[PDB]
Design a protein around this nucleic acid. Structure first.
Lengths: 146, 51, 64
RNA sequence: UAUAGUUGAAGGAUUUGGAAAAUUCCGCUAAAGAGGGUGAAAGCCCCGUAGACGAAAUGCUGACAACACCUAGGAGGAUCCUGAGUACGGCGGAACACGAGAAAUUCCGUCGGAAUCCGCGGGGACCAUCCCGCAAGGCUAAAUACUCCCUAGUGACCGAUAGUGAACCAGUACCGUGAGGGAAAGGUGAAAAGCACCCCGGAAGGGGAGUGAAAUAGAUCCUGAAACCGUGUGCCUACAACAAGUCAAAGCUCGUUAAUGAGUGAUGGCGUGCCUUUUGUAGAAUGAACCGGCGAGUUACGAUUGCAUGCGAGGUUAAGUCGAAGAGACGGAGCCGCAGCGAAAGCGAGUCUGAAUAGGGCGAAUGAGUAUGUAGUCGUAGACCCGAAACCAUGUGAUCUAC
RNA sequence: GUAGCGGAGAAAUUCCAAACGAACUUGGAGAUAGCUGGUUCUCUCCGAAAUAGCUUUAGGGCUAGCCUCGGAAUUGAGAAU
RNA sequence: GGUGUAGUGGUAGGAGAGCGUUCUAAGGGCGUUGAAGGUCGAUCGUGAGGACGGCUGGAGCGCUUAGAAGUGAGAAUGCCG
RNA sequence: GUGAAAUUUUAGUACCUGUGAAGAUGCAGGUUACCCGCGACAGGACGGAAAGACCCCAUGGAGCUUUACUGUAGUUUGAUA
């Protein structure tokens, strides 16, 4: 490419629309705003969610629930992701990281059974669902909550 | 390449010539010139950083 | 600056798995002698937000 | 080291011009082809530039010397010390993102008012247990904010209605008792060579003659548009009701970017300006004397959609460090996506309601994202421009008028 | 000598530097105005509304109805007899 | 490229594609044997608009491709002359 | 001899009966009328000057009243230093 023959890719740059520049362009004389009214003024308009004066929808509906301060959220990995390891590896939270499978392990890892394993792993993690542990042990491995 | 300072001094001031070291090549330097005159040492040094 | 969320909407609504918005019902705190048992049984189930309301509400709940 | 300075390479002829730096030939120089000047556009004409050199005097910043200060272990646990109208409490106010609230923590006014290492304070009312500290005495560099001013520079910033209010003797002239308000106004030529002498005229001004490449470049001086005011001419016009043109057309006068030519035009048909606001306008509804200049959807940061490119069950870095105000590498804290349901405990391809394995709600069942560019809309900011009557807080007035 | 949240009044809302139902000047300040005026080049394709509901609402707004652009989808779902 | 058939009034408003101004970069050019600007002509294109020639004028300016915008004026009882 | 002003879309600017945003110099059908001025009069140009002071609106202001709401200076009464 030479600096006197540049060309962007097709569809990648568009021009711009300038209002208030004559009648034949399509947007002269009031610039798309219609005739008079609150919406034709500079800085005119009503705030988001406003409805005239009818009771707004958020205000007819009731509030609900509370936030728990000791809430625990985990960092699920199901069963297909444990197929990208060799037969017999002892998968763990540091080998999951450094493969990028899990970054930001919120409160620890939890394995879930969805849906099919065929390996010989020995999984170390913080939680196991009833079917994850089960299918891990059918294929022939072991678990340990830790 | 590097502290090849006599060569860079000799090559300045010629109105067709630009001088750059091998740790400081940009995309705009290569596109604007018609050719590149690189030494053997500097070529391996560029291959070491672009990897 | 950043956009501020409507804190009164967020205390009343939650976002479902396919992008919708689950909501509670009205007429559910007050004089139940004025309504039938079938009404108060069927005003105990949650519902969703309509399309007219969502179009006008979307930007106030963008982040949560 | 700041405040003066020194030295610093390499060109002549030819053509056109008033004058070359331009053109054409044939040379040279560069650790210097950044920039400015010269009768037009110069690496080689002048000032400079890259490089090398320099300070009597005064002020700054380092380094190393002196001089000044400051700094020791192990054991014991009989007794003494460790900041009092203080911490804290009631009442009234305020500060904490926290509007009295279930209100911890920190202040102010007022009244009441501890303990002493077997002690005292805190972990968001309060208590018990465990854990972390030791108030009511003092000081302290750096990493962060700002530019009246001095030096050296930079700009996909302005170019005389712009840019400072002010390119010029501007906070001036001018206006007001005062506080205060506040302008207009740049350009002969390369060089003044800025018109000796003569003629008309009181002078102003003009005509010759001269300067000069050019004076219709003559000081109201580069260029010299329009409104507006004149002089000369080809064609028409004194029986005619005209939004002023348009279509048809004899006569006269010319002869062009050369082609189904140009100007004027007796006479005939048709025909109620422009803009705004309106159900509706020629409107006796609204605006404009005319001509020229200026004069209105922008940017920053967020959110969403379409298009485009790179990676792809993944994508991507922020502050910061080195670097030419740059590109061009380090940096994985963090952010989005990859799993949902429920108020929550929690369970998980399912979950909640429910006595229910029933039914139903929301989810799964191959079901694509993320960074950046670009355009359309929206939010917070004056947010497309102009326009009040008013409200508040400093100050200046009884040289007029009232007592 | 008395000064603007003020003064003075043989009382009229009268005077306080040609303007007083609350002086003048500077600043908050580009105050606010659901109202009025204005908003600058061209051609091609399509092309409305003046209605319902709710509104301290009635010359403003919101949701639907009616226009335009891009996609998806089984059809034979639209219309006229 | 041919040939058929069908279409092409338009306010608010949506969608597409272009004309012209100033500045930046790269390339290729012009200029005292006369640049920009000004004035006249009977010229070209579907439109915004583009050339060529005369006269005036005295030192700078086009074209191509991409970029960036204080980018277009007839109206505001607009502001200055 | 000297020498302004308010106004102004461009004007080669007749009458009658009609028409029309419902009272026309300018539109229709007729009728009348050679070109250019001077001194006089006020019927028309919904004549000029003043974005109606009358009336209603803006969820506009400002001054005033009170047994309208919510506060407060001042006066008073108790506890405590």
């Amino acid at each position: 490419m030479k600096l006197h023959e540049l060309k962007p890719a097709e569809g990648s740059r568009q021009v711009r629309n300038r209002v208030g520049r004559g009648t034949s362009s399509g947007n002269g004389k009031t610039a798309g705003r219609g005739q008079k009214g609150q919406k034709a003024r500079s800085g005119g308009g009503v705030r988001l969610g406003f409805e005239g004066g009818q009771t707004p929808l958020f205000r007819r509906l009731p509030k609900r629930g509370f936030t728990n301060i000791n809430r625990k959220d985990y960092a699920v990995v199901n069963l297909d992701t444990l197929n990208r390891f060799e037969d017999g590896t002892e998968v763990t939270p540091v080998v999951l990281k450094e493969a990028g499978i899990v970054k930001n392990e919120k409160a620890g890892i939890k394995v879930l059974a969805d849906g099919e394993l065929t390996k010989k792993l020995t999984v170390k993690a913080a939680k196991f669902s009833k079917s994850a542990q089960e299918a891990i042990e059918a294929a022939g491995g072991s678990i340990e909550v830790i | 390449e590097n502290g090849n300072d006599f060569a860079a001094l000799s090559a300045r001031n010629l109105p067709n010539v630009s001088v750059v070291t091998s740790d400081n090549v940009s995309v705009l330097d290569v596109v604007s010139a018609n050719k590149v005159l690189a030494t053997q040492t500097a070529l391996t040094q560029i291959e070491e950083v672009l990897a | 600056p950043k956009q501020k969320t409507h804190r009164g909407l967020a205390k009343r609504v939650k976002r479902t798995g396919g992008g919708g918005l689950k909501r509670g019902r009205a007429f559910t705190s007050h004089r139940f002698h004025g309504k039938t048992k079938k009404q108060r049984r069927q005003l105990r189930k949650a519902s969703m937000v309509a399309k007219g309301d969502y179009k006008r509400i979307r930007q106030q709940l963008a982040r949560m």
